[PDB]
Amino acid sequence: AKKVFKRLEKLFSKIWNDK
- Report the C-alpha gap between 11 and 13 in whole angstroms: 5
Q: Which residues are CB-neighbours of 17 under 8 A, at least 6 positions away? A: none
- Radius of gyration of the chain from Cα atoms? 9
Distances (CA, A) of 1 to 6, 12, 14: 12, 20, 24
- Report the C-alpha gap between 17 and 10 in whole angstroms: 11
Q: Is 9 helix (H, G, I), strand (E, B) or coil?
A: helix
Q: Is 5 helix (H, G, I), strand (E, B) or coil?
A: helix
* Structural determination approach: NMR
Q: Which residues are CB-neighbours of 5 under 8 A, at least 6 positions away? A: none
